[PDB]
Amino acid sequence: MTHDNKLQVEAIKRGTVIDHIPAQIGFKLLSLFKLTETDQRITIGLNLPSGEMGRKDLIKIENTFLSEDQVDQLALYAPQATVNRIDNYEVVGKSRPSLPERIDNVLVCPNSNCISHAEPVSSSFAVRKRANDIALKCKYCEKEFSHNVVLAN
Amino acid sequence: MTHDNKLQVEAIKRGTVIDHIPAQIGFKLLSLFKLTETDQRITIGLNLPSGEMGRKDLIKIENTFLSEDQVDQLALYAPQATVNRIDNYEVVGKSRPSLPERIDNVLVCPNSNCISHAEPVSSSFAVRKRANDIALKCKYCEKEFSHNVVLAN
Amino acid sequence: ANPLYQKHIISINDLSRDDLNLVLATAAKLKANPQPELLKHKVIASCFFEASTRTRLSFETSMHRLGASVVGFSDSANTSLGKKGETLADTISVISTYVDAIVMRHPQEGAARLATEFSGNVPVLNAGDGSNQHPTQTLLDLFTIQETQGRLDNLHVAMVGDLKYGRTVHSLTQALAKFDGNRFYFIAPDALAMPQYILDMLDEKGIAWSLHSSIEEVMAEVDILYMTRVQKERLDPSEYANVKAQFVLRASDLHNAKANMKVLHPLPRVDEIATDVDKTPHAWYFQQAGNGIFARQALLALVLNRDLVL
Amino acid sequence: ANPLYQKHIISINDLSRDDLNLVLATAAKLKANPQPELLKHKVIASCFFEASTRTRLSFETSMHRLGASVVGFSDSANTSLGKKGETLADTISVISTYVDAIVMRHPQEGAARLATEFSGNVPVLNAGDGSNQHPTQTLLDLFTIQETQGRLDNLHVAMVGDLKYGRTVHSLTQALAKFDGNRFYFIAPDALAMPQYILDMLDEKGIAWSLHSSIEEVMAEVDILYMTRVQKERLDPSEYANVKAQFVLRASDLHNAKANMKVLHPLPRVDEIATDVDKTPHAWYFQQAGNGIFARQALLALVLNRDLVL
Amino acid sequence: ANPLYQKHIISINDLSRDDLNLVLATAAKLKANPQPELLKHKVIASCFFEASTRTRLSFETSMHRLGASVVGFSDSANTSLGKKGETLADTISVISTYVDAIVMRHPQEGAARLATEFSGNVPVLNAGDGSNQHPTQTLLDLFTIQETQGRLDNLHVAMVGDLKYGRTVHSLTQALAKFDGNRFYFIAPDALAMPQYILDMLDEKGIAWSLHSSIEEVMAEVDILYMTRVQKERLDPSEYANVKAQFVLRASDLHNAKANMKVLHPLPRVDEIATDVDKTPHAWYFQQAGNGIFARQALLALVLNRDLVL
Amino acid sequence: ANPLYQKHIISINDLSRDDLNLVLATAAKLKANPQPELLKHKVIASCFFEASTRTRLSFETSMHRLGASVVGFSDSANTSLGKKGETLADTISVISTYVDAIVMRHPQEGAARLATEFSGNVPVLNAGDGSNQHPTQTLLDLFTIQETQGRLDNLHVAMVGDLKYGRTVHSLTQALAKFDGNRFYFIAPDALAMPQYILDMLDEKGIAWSLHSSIEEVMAEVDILYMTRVQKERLDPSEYANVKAQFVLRASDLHNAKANMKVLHPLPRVDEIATDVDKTPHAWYFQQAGNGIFARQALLALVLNRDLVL
Numbered sequence A, B: 001m002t003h004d005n006k007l008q009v010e011a012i013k014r015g016t017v018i019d020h021i022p023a024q025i026g027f028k029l030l031s032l033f034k035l036t037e038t039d040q041r042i043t044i045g046l047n048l049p050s051g052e053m054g055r056k057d058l059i060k061i062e063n064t065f066l067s068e069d070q071v072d073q074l075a076l077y078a079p080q081a082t083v084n085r086i087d088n089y090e091v092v093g094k095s096r097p098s099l100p101e102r103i104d105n106v107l108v109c110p111n112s113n114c115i116s117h118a119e120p121v122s123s124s125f126a127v128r129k130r131a132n133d134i135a136l137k138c139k140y141c142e143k144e145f146s147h148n149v150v151l152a153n
Numbered sequence C, D, E, F: 001a002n003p004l005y006q007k008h009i010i011s012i013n014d015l016s017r018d019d020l021n022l023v024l025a026t027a028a029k030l031k032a033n034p035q036p037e038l039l040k041h042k043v044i045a046s047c048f049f050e051a052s053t054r055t056r057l058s059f060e061t062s063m064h065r066l067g068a069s070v071v072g073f074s075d076s077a078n079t080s081l082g083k084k085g086e087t088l089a090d091t092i093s094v095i096s097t098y099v100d101a102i103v104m105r106h107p108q109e110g111a112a113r114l115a116t117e118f119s120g121n122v123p124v125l126n127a128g129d130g131s132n133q134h135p136t137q138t139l140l141d142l143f144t145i146q147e148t149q150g151r152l153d154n155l156h157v158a159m160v161g162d163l164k165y166g167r168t169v170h171s172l173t174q175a176l177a178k179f180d181g182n183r184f185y186f187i188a189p190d191a192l193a194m195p196q197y198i199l200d201m202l203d204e205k206g207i208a209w210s211l212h213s214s215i216e217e218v219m220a221e222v223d224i225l226y227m228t229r230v231q232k233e234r235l236d237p238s239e240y241a242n243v244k245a246q247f248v249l250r251a252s253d254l255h256n257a258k259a260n261m262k263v264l265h266p267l268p269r270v271d272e273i274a275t276d277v278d279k280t281p282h283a284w285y286f287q288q289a290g291n292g293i294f295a296r297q298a299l300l301a302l303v304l305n306r307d308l309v310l
Ligand SMILES: Nc1ccn([C@@H]2O[C@H](COP(=O)(O)OP(=O)(O)OP(=O)(O)O)[C@@H](O)[C@H]2O)c(=O)n1
Pocket: A008, A009, A010, A011, A012, A013, A014, A017, A019, A060, A082, A084, A086, A088, A089, A090, A091, A094
């Protein structure tokens, strides 16, 4: 409680605000990381009018603080987002994501003979080589692919 | 004003507002009906207080008038949802979902031998309220199933 | 143009009473005066993605007796399509590029109706899709009831055998329900019972049916006795064998049968109808399969031909 | 008599420009006014020693549309010949003893030309021999380029896919080289490159070609985009999958395509051309397979018929 | 000697309450204090005329864990014996001069009892015979019920799935009915329900039983939940899918179970038990398969050794 | 305990230079002073979901030579487990309560690493997993290189044949690159060449390598010639034959080799190594297969035994 509006919607009390989501990444991040599977109120702003990117997405999850590595699972998808941590209407913390060393769960090994497909295992990829462009190596078949390839299906 | 309510909810100027989405169906409806594949301003709220009829979700989709057909397919999911269009800052129409004729696209045939599984087809089931439930008959295999067997799969 | 012109015959549920009577009145004329060059120059595809010799030889003879050419494959004997990921939407989009009608059997239910979305203007006639439909078997069954009993209404039709998984009994019950005052007797092992959705449809139309566990209970009143194949995999060896393999007809059972009664069976029959029944005048199962030729010829005529001069 | 009369159509390399244009001008007439009894009383053998349904159904419909009878076998489903040491020289010496032309597919390269040494005066038309030739696929591809582009020269033809093992791209490059001023763009994974002996033949005729690794580089200039099946056994799972499965066409890619551009594909296509491309007017792969009917009919007409009255 | 010394283990029906307790008593000693050179110098034959890798490896590991040697086979479309020509009776007559004990699994019922009449004094142990009997599965289920629950009497046991044809559920009810005061809940699709004979037996002994349609209806009183796999080939694919919100198990369903309630399944488990059940304390099907070793060690030691003072 | 005690042996990538030396050190002791009752009372499972008779017999003989017992299987179109329904994860979860160690070979990559997450404290050893890894082949190649050459460092090693898909050559380069100063000559058909990743790794460590087109070009500097079989199904039969005067080996070619130059081949060898090479002193592929016994004895002893004072 304090002012909302929507050009830059406002103030939840205590919780996380992931802001400056690229655009059209918001729902991907909701889906993939299952941020929705919470009983807390979530407010989401999609295709919003803002500062340098012009139109961005934003997600406010109150009463949940996610960080350290949750914030990092966002780097492949939303690398230039900020994750505001809020306590009592003030941003007591502000993180940016960084490429992790392992991305569990969210990806699919493009190698069709991989065993991972068929089984009660979570996918896992060792990550490497920042921004000149990322390689991802499957835990199981140990094949290394370009991130853009794993990321197309 | 204050009995917190909204925190001055983003009165969209023109568009569709979907309210009383029963809790947890809110995200389902975004995925299934692909409501986020638009470049217009959406503001979503999940697990909002419905001191009135449960706890709820609500999607406000701007400069968009989802109608008629589009409103009825939501019947299987949020039977208790009111869609409200807005042309200039207040409610121009308020429509409830009525069960439709057919449900296309979203829904999978339970029948593992149905041809729809393997092929470039779009699901189509015929809706029939066998008062006690709604039976759904597949266009292709013509097998009839309880709407609940199909809704899990 | 006649109502069936360029129509896809995919389900019994889509054919009205009027449709059913038209086919049946045309089969009767072609049976009486043949038309051997009516489909001259037409080329039809006979696609049996699942093999079924009986049905294939009868559909193709029917096409040969109206003068059409036939091209096509029987499979479950790897005649290589579906090879290297080829979808059925793509197979049918290429086959309709050069034949005038497609006849097809396929193991999955729904396949003939999907062929319909890709064929353009080439008719698709279904010769069987999984456990769903088989219109052409019901059209020949109907034609044989009509021709031997003189009518398709006010019949006392008994259905015997595996009524739960038999695809032909389920369709014929639906077709006969199109008509008036027919009465049903179902005689089945408890494990092979006529499904509720059939019974529910009969109830909702005020049609009368009943369950009996011996044919002897109903012989006297019966006009058509449609027997069915129980396949021994639908039960275990000892079950089939037990007190249940006595849904089997022998000649002595027919003693009190009406003079008009007929025994129909889609075939193959292995042992549910004993060989001594063949010498009776009530045995009409082979004559029934002969009637498959005029019911399939009439459908091909009405579908490929605008105006049929009869 | 016409030049193709009683000729064996075994390789593209044996057909001149004049031969290629004759077949193609005859296909255009038969497509316009059909001749359904031209091969009346002829009986043709359709010998597919290796199965290929697509090709067989199209060759046989073509024979049925000019009025000929067909006898024959599809195999790799043990229709028993080659049994008890029977040589191919001996099979063909017995088959030519009673049919008027032999159409044949066989797994070994060279088999159709050996059939030629034993057939006497019965023409042998090759429907595929191992990784060597397939004239009738190139004749239909040519016919479809001509009919949609109005010419067979001065074309900008892109070839995409597995160019190293694809038997149809190698023949079409050779046929198009018969003609004038065509320009080639080859777009292939490094492991599936167009072979040197093709490139060497193009160079020696002053025909221009170039290599590109994205269709986006060449879309604007392209008249015919002949796509090909990459079979995933030609690479390993992870290779196919890797940065190489992007020789795949989607609808968005066609944005800048010329109004006349067409997408051709021998078929089956599994995923190299996405399903949304079908709704575009540039998708001509199914129409291409329909044209297989008039290119095969014209060859059968010219080969079995002395003087063709057109 | 011990009661079972040199005895044939062919049916649960043939073993008294005391025999079942003696096996269970021994299997707990062998679990606690291993005796690895107990059957040193014995050769057992693992004759699997029907392949079952899981049963075969449990048994051979039992054999080896007591130090015995093993010769044998498994036959899916291969390897000579029983041929059709060679009778089972002559296979056994010959193998019973080579070995000390025979463990066998065969497709037809009573193959084990036939063997008994031809093995001389060589004990034969049944590892499954058609749909009839599988003693050593019931022995390891009762060992796991006794080891988790503390007793084999006054148990609230729920059996779920295909009760009509799960051979292990027929056996386990026979066996659990030699003890006192057990109460049975049978939750099955009515097409797949416990046969009247198990039920009729149960009423003679005065045992309490009830039939429910959902595990939900009894989750709260139950001590053992014995799940069986439902056999999709005996059902229709659409029958199979349209039953309640099924009879499969998930952790959600377990929020109600008693603390000592355990879930057993003879395995394989395709989808009736989801992966989240595996992490609860109620999951006991893998421990159940481990106890297979100790139940079959006990049976082999009692049969081949006269007095066992362990 | 020893470094590898109770450890999973899934990839060469996972074992340090010191681990590889410890295995090689042990394998030389076991070769010299046999310890036949070292794994007395242990049962190992030889789960070959993919048949490989040569690897399977080497391993089982390793098992037996240290006195362990063996239960297991090989599955080509037969025998139950992994079924499709049964997951690999449930096969392993169940087999890991029966045995003490699991050796397994499977067709899909990473099947071994999946197993690791389900075997409890039961070690699993990879005997091949698709095109990914085969640790115990690399261990016996390095044992044979160390035993013939005297060291694993400063070696001039030539790898020949299908370098793109020989899984053993990918592994052997990884492993030979934990040691110092090795120089690599890669002689392959450019369609079958060492992938850029092995090469790129090799440049990071600063290792010297070169690509040649004929063994003739390096016969003189070479200490190990490691031949691989070239896979004719990934080539075209005419591609396969038209390469130089090939890349196969004959004694003539060897007139130039150093006295301690040896020829290794993982086998089978169809025609890349002729029969006259077998009688020269440079022939070492059969001794190489014999050392497979001592390399796998060492790995099994280190995994299952805590301290080994041999
Ligand atoms: N109780 C509050 C306080 C702040 N915000 C959100 O916190 C985010 C960023 O925090 P802030 O530092 O206060 O504004 P900025 O200076 O724009 O932060 P940055 O430059 O890192 O984006 C904004 O999206 C704002 O909506 C919020 O929703 N609720």
